[PDB]
Design a protein around this ligand. Structure first.
Ligand SMILES: Nc1nc2c(ncn2[C@@H]2O[C@H](COP(=O)(O)O)[C@@H](O)[C@H]2O)c(=O)[nH]1
Ligand SMILES: Nc1nc2c(ncn2[C@@H]2O[C@H](COP(=O)(O)O)[C@@H](O)[C@H]2O)c(=O)[nH]1
Lengths: 204, 199
């Protein structure tokens, strides 16, 4: 039985990665994917942990080679989910969670129909600024640019099945866990998981 | 934000009632709806607890008056959800849970947009038989299979193997359903407008 594909999107600085990491620790049957990006490393980021950082030429080499399940030009740099991070896992029955923008989510929706997609909103525009200057010394000009890029991402929230507002951290984690739990209870998934039981109950 | 309408159906002997009651204890923002029925009261039954018991003539008067949100002929008697048990609560932002048969669930799905329907199955054929005179027992098992044949009409399916897990799963369904986009667009309309407006 194929794994379920999950998408959790949010502008950076809304706290999605902390929510996802806490959610997966509680629900370990879902694997996280590490994206590729040609954007420059920001302070505090670790290559091979937050992203696989590569050159633009290497990334475009990987585009041309067909290495990406989805990829997109995100805020003036390449971002991408490697084919090897998703397609074999899903084919092997492993659930996979992608943290990608709306452009990537749209490509994934056309590739995998039943993807479960969640958007996480910050509790205010101010909340975005606060989390950004606690991740590293960014200039006012860069903070203004990233805030603008955040609004651009949030304009596409309506494309997602669920919306979580990250007001209380432990509550947002509970809510993302409820969404993941509920998705395994959907009729079509349960028909597969309990096919034998259903056959027994409906037999005369 | 309007309340959500939830439907939980199951054959007899699947344990649905205990799961629903335990779920309501955990989630007090959910009102349970008391159905009307024309079935005769058994000695000791309390009108207004499990049902609002009325005469068949009164039930049929309510059909004719359009008073029922949904109603059906269930196991040889009338059963019905009165409009007044649903529409005011939902309009006041209170979630409402209906315990009705598959015939009723079909009517509600067509009427109310975001209706969430859940079907609960026993963990095995033996477990169903155990929970249940040979002809009466066979009759009740036959009614159970007829009910379970319609599980495919429901959005979610819970197999009641472990009780506390079944309650967690029902709670997860209620929680997740409130996070659905269209509900959140209403609930957070002001926040969304601010976030999407430029400087
Ligand atoms: N399409 C796509 N977007 C990604 C990928 N990885 C991260 N992003 C998204 O790019 C945006 C910018 O993230 P940041 O550059 O601040 O780390 C975020 O919305 C993030 O989720 C990816 O693999 N594909
Ligand atoms: N359509 C409909 N079915 C109901 C209603 N209340 C109970 N039922 C159904 O009637 C059947 C018998 O319920 P009982 O009274 O025997 O516990 C169950 O399948 C239950 O779902 C109602 O308001 N409407």
């Amino acid at each position: 039985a194929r794994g379920t594909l999950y998408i959790v999107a949010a502008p950076s600085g809304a706290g999605k990665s902390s929510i996802v990491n806490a959610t997966l620790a509680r629900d370990p049957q879902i694997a996280l994917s590490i994206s590729f990006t040609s954007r420059a490393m920001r302070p505090g980021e670790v290559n091979g942990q937050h992203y696989h950082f590569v050159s633009a030429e290497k990334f475009e080499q990987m585009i041309a080679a067909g290495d990406f399940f989805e990829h997109a030009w995100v805020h003036g740099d390449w971002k991408g989910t490697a084919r090897q991070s998703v397609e074999p896992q899903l084919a092997a029955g492993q659930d996979v969670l992608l943290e990608i923008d709306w452009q990537g989510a749209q490509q994934v929706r056309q590739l995998v129909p039943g993807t479960v997609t969640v958007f996480i909103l910050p509790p205010s525009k101010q909340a975005l600024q606060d989390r950004m200057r606690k991740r590293g010394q960014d200039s006012e000009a860069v903070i203004a640019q990233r805030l603008g890029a955040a609004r651009d991402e949030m304009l596409h929230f309506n494309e997602f099945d669920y919306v979580i507002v990250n007001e209380v951290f432990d509550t947002a984690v509970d809510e993302l866990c409820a969404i993941f739990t509920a998705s395994r209870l959907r009729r079509e998934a349960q028909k597969v998981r309990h096919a034998g039981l259903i056959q027994a109950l409906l037999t005369p």
